[PDB]
Amino acid sequence: TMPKPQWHPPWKLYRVISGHLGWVRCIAVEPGNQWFVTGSADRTIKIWDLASGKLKLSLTGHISTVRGVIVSTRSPYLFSCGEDKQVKCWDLEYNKVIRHYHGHLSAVYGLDLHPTIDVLVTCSRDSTARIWDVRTKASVHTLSGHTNAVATVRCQAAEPQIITGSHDTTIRLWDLVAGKTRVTLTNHKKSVRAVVLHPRHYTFASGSPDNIKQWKFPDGSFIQNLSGHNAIINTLTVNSDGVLVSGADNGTMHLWDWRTGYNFQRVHAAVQPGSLDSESGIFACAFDQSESRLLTAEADKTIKVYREDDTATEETHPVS
Amino acid sequence: RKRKRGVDYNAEIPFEKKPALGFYDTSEENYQAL
Amino acid sequence: TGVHLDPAVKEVQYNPTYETMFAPEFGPENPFRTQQMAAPRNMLSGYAE
Amino acid sequence: EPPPYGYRKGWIPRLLEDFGDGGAFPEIHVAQYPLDMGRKKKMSNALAIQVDSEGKIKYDAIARQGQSKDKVIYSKYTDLVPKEVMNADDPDLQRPDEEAIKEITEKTRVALEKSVSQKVAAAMPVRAADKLAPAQYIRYTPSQQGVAFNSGAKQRVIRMVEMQKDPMEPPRFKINKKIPRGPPSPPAPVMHSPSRKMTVKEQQE
Amino acid sequence: WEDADFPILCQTCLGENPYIRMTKEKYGKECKICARPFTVFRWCPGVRMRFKKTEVCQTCSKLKNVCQTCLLDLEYGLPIQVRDAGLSFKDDMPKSDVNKEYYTQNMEREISNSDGTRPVGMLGKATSTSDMLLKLARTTPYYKRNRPHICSFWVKGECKRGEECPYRHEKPTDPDDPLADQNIKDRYYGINDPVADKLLKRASTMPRLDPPEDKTITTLYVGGLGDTITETDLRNHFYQFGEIRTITVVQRQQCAFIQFATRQAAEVAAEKSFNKLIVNGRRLNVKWGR
Amino acid sequence: QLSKQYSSRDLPSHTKIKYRQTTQDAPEEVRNRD
Amino acid sequence: WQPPNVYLETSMGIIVLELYWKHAPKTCKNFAELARRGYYNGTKFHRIIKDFMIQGGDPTGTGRGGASIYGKQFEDELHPDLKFTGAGILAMANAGPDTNGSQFFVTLAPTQWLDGKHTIFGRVCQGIGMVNRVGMVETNSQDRPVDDVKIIKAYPSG
Amino acid sequence: PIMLLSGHEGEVYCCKFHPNGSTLASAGFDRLILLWNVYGDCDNYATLKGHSGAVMELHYNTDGSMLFSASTDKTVAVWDSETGERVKRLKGHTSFVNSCYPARRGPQLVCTGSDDGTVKLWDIRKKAAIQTFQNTYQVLAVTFNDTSDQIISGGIDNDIKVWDLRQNKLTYTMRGHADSVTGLSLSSEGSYLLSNAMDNTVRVWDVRPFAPKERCVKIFQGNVHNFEKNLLRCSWSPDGSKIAAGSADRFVYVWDTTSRRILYKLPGHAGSINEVAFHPDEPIIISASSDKRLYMGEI
Amino acid sequence: AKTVTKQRVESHFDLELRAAVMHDILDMMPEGIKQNKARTILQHLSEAWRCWKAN
Q1: Domain ranges of chain G
Q2: G41 is in an annotated binding site
Q3: How many Å apart are CA H29 and CA H9, to the nearest integer?
Q4: Strands (E), D14-172
Q5: Which residues contact H121 (CB under 8 A, 6 or more apart)?
Q6: In which order are the strands placed within the sheet that holds G122-124?
Q7: Which of A274, E263, G11, G139 has a 20 to 30 A CA-CA distance from A284?
Q8: Which of D44, D49, D66 is the closest to B27 by Cβ?
Q9: DSSP class of residue D187?
Q10: H39 phi and psi, to 5 degrees?
Q11: Rounded Cα distance, A191 and A170, in Å
Q12: Residue E108: its chain F contacts at CB < 8 A?
């Protein structure tokens, strides 16, 4: 078996925000932890306060579904990416788009920012990713080689610097400078829509309807499985304390232990009043910066906030 | 005679990919005519 | 034997001695190589520096 | 078998059976072909049947077809097995120390931005044309050596100078040519878990 | 676009002075084969010789292993067809437009992954220089290649430029000659180039040792032996090449008669030695005895 | 094979990157904060 | 001390070579002492000439290494009638007379050229088809072939 | 490490150390004199200016307090390493002054070899000439004798010449070099003197009160000349143990006083090496080459 | 790679909607192994929409 998993307390829902007019597809938190930002399929970008849950501001520039937002830690910039094939840079001292990155040939499914250099990486449905230069809007590399839409991309400072998962069920680890794939991982049988990197362990995990898998950098050596969540998995998100959240597309959300891979909670939330029951689904989840709150962006146009439960103990909720 | 891609069929193997070689000798193999 | 350098290795960060730098290679030279395949070549027809 | 050492005189081994367990007779003025020896064979296509450092048959070769050794190729069963890395402690897995990260960042920044600069200087197109670099000197060792060539010197020294570009000159060549895209890379091996069965009833469903 | 460090050229075509001065032009012209733009290098061959120019891509060169302007092979130096035949090669480079542009694109992508050191493909798997190739090879630099053209004016009388007539003011060659019209494209592809056929006929008329009728004629006559050779030396000529059965070193005629143990061994030895078994500097004549 | 075509939208624009200043939220402060 | 068949089970196949001390006592003793010494483990083939030679046994793997049992190197023990007329003639090659060290050669065909410059010191009594296979393998332009083929086990006869 | 230095626009002809072993001076075609710090990252602090011609030879004093530098423009210059500023412009040379040498441990006095046909003796304070031995022709290198009373010079006529400062006649003429001598350097023995000459041979001599009358001591092979005929210079080690030479062959030649063996022919350069500098303290080597940069080898 | 302007808003919405549907289940909740008929589930999608519109 295994040593026995660490005990983590369970999480309870405590807030439900509802102001969007279409599915909510992406969510992100500011560096300084005061507000978060959601992008939805009603083509707006709303900016909410993280303490009160009040809505501060609504930015409307896109022409279709906003499928990714991110907030840069080095500059007052928010980068958004839509299904209109366009990638935008909003400057948050005037709240206006100042820069737009052109060249993708179909909807852009996701986007990440490099933590030290000033580049962008975007993945799209033309089955390529691109490395953009933040400052001159010039595409410095087109990472090509997948054979179907590129569902997700994550980038890091260490090496390899870019991990993409795509719908042709493959993961690739790329080098940023050379611009070509070092490793191709074909263990999954179904589309890889979720990838996450451990904050402090040089390992990463990749989610698919088969099962989540863990891999070990820099050449992606298999480590273990995490099975039990049989659902189209849209997100993975890891805490610094080894909690791993796996959000599915039928609404169900499992919480796991990262190290031993032990699923310690299963949340099955409820749909907003006027919703059908075929419209429960999680599209994005994000931990707070204090790693205390867990925000989720759902297919019933709500944002649900979970906080940890403080009044439970190893004997109230034992570890099987 | 003015057609750019026509003879791309009857003169030459249109875009030839020769099979990869592995652990065996394919040299002596040859095939019959019709 | 003492420290010799790989003759094909040209990027050498160690200060080589006379014998440690130009030690001769043992063996026969392959009789199958034309003048072109025998000379030291960076380019297709010759080294150029 | 092979006659004794010093008493192997007189006999000239023509069929390798005369080799016993094998061996060439250096004192025998015949070309010894012991156990398939000596005879240059036809050039066959079969690539080198390599064998690992323990005597195993490295079939990694046929998947690695025509590729560097930078490629990491997972093609063995042992790549699927769960490694027991249920350890919170091992210093095997901890990110590189931030100093090495600083080195990688500087190097990447350099290469990245220089390629940026060329790609954007393309988007200048009104090139603030700088002067042509000073004439370079290159020393050239031909492969063909012969006193009758190069008038008897085994080197030539050449002065590179780059020709002026006429400012008022339109592009010269047609850029837009279309062709189908090349073959991809050698297909990677599909490392799945074994398939399970679908009953007739499920396919009915 | 290609981008090079220097040309890659025959020593004949590179010139005579050890010190040459050459100009580069980036993206200067279009390869007559690869059809894509190249960097074009131009040098003055010698005193009163035409400026020559690299006329084929660096990839179109490395592929077939030739000199970017002289077009002759790099090691031996014969027309591309002759070298191909002597290496028994079968070069499958496409001909039609789309197939050829596609083949060029992928061959270039794969040659990008090289070391820039030796030709790609069978040109490494065919470097076994056959004695026919070595025998046809040029010996000293045929530097008549670099003199200027024929002055249409001075052929009609008109080259009133004095002595500066931009072309050799000599007699124009009769256009009936096969050595007149050899288009660049064919000379690169090796399809019906007249110089190749003339050189091949020359190589067919060149002396090589003849084979006998009877299998039992396993005595081989080597003529022109001289009395500086030993029976053990004739052995060392025909000892490891197979087996020799007997050796008669005829000193009353300065010849030798080698009885072998394998017909193919002696045949290979003597044919490979035909007039060219140069041991102690003697032109021996290898033939099958009576 | 680089074109000399060009675009109205590829002119230089916003050529300096703003960096997050001392009080806005610089990576130093967020590195500190509780 | 003349080990009859020195077994060098390479990765790519088994081998055992018979050295004639009566013709080559010095190099037979040297090679036996090396094979029993186990120093040959790790020696990558430093030259492979297709249908000509396989030469390895270099503690550098480049060709500027190698040492003998009497120091750095010693002289050659010539034979009048022993030659390289056929494959497998095990003769330590040298870049100059009286300087033959650790480097080992194995003929693959008649090598009447190496006669007089390398002392034919035996023949490989095990693994000649394997010798042919290693001789067919594709090599780089420096005869250090693309395959890092090494000996697994180096030892002499009992 | 290899520690290659760059920042010079044209050939560097002369590179030498502080006699402290603290700072580095190099100079050449670019008509100015660059300075560096030998330790740390081998970094550049100062640049001396003024010399209109090429700096053909820079020379320290034996403490390191003022700098001498022979220029192509008919002039020598002494400067203040304290400041870098000119104190004296030794003019009056009627042609190309290539070589300069400040008297060591004697009164402050300078011998300069030039392309005029004279060797010139100068006092720094008077702004006037002391003595001048017009033999016939160009003198290409000049060094004193540790008594500061003979002066040695090497030019085109291959017979190394030495003048007595008091009788002012050709004191000592030595012979045996087949072609023009290009460099003299007297070891810190005060006795053994080293001579490079492009005939491909280097020689060792010894100026003493009594010498065997034919003092051609040791001979080494290896140096090269070619169509360049660049000026080739040699040096002893601080110990008189190793001789370092450069040549137009891109090979730093390091030999020994003892066994005259080739301890080194080191590659690494791109153009001819014109001057090798030994550290007065360390086993540190600095190569000035015509490839417009320098090397800092450690042995 | 032309932008999405004002005449291509509807046609593009439908492009991306049915690309999404084809990703969604007809390749990630299958086990109609043989041929998952996704070209016919898309027909059901269009007809469900017309039926919505007709009430």
Answers
A1: 1-158
A2: no
A3: 8
A4: 136-142, 156-162
A5: H109, H110, H111, H129, H130, H131, H132, H151, H165
A6: G122-124, G16-19, G5-10, G151-155
A7: A274
A8: D44
A9: P
A10: -100, -175
A11: 7
A12: none
Residues of B in contact with E98 (CB under 8 A): 4-5, 8
Cα–Cα dist A54/A56, whole Å: 6
The C-alpha angle with vertex H287 and arms to H282 and H291, in degrees rounded to 5, equals 160
Select the residue of G110, G115, G141 nearest E241 (Cβ to Cβ). Answer: G110
| Cβ count within 10 A of residue I43 | 11
**Backbone phi, then psi, for A319, in 5-degree steps?**
-100, 120
Q: In sequence order, which ranges of chain D are alpha helices (DSSP H)?
A: 60-63, 98-123, 200-204
Angle between helices I9-24 and I38-54 (to 10 degrees): 130
CATH (domain of H270): 2.130.10.10
Contact indicator for E31, E38 with CB cutoff of 8 Å: yes
Distance CA A168, CA A166 (A): 5
CB A170 within 8 A of CB A150: no
- Among chain F residues, the shortest Cα distance to E36 is held by F1
G67 is in an annotated binding site: no
Q: Experimental method used, please?
A: cryo-EM
Tell me if A114 sits within 8 A of A140, measured CB to CB: no
Tokens of A171: 């993961």
The secondary structure of residue D130, as a DSSP letter, is P
Question: Chain D contacts of I32, Cβ < 8 Å?
Answer: 203
For chain D, report the end-to-end CA distance as a whole number of angstroms: 75
Domain G1-158, CATH number (from 2.40.100.10, 3.40.30.10, 1.20.1250.20, 3.40.50.300): 2.40.100.10
Residue of G nearest to C19 (CA): G64
Question: Could you give the strand order of the β-sheet that contains H4-6, starting from the edge strand earlier in sequence?
Answer: H4-6, H293-298, H284-289, H273-278
Look up residue I2 and give its two tokens.
């032309």
Q: How many CB atoms lie within 10 A of CB G84?
A: 26
Of E8, E67, E129, the CB nearest to C43: E8
Instruction: For residue G149, give both structure tokens.
Output: 């083929």
**Residues of chain E in Cβ contact (below 8 Å) with chain C:** 5-6, 8-9, 61-62, 65, 67, 74-76, 116-119, 127-129
Q: Hey, are the CB atoms on D142 and C46 less than 8 Å from each other? A: yes
Subunits close to B (at least 3 CB pairs below 8 A): D, E
Burial class (CB in 10 A: 0-12, 13-18, 19+), B8: buried
The structural domain count of chain H equals 1
* First-to-last C-alpha distance (Å) of chain A: 12
Entry resolution in angstroms? Answer: 3.0
Q: Which residues contact E22 (CB under 8 A, 6 or more apart)?
A: D158, D159, D160, D161, E7, E41, E42, E43
State the fold for domain E219-288: Alpha-Beta Plaits (3.30.70)
The closest of C40, A175, E215 to G141, measured between CA atoms, is: C40
Judge contact between G89 and G123, C-beta under 8 A: yes
Inter-chain Cβ pairs, chain E and chain G, closer than 8 A? 15
Distance CA A1, CA A16 (A): 39
